[PDB]
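A quick word before the example. In earlier lectures we treated sequence and structure as two separate objects. From today on, think of them as two lines of the same record. Here is Protein MICAL-2 written that way.
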Amino acid sequence: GSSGSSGDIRPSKLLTWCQQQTEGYQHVNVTDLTTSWRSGLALCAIIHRFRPELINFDSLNEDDAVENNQLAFDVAEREFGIPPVTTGKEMASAQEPDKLSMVMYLSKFYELFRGTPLRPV
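And the structure line, produced from the sequence above:
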């Protein structure tokens, strides 16, 4: 949103969490909170992580971005009831989405998952 923000980032902390959850996966390099979730795999990874019976990354093919997105969205709207801000198609179509609209969305997954405090593994 800012014209030229530099120095301190808002989602700075948010990113970490995500990058951590996705950490380990294959062909999944999360560096930002915009394009890193343009294919869907990013999110799907976080979900499947806890409940693999819901999402099967194995089937999620990069090319099948649109589907890879719709899946997570629906699943989240069926289990968590969280409505998707963008459409799978648009998610993949749009080259550079609004980091804002993204953060506001991802956040839901951050708080929804981040519950009671527990010593670091």
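Notice the following. The longest helix spans residues 65-80. We will return to this example when we discuss secondary structure assignment.
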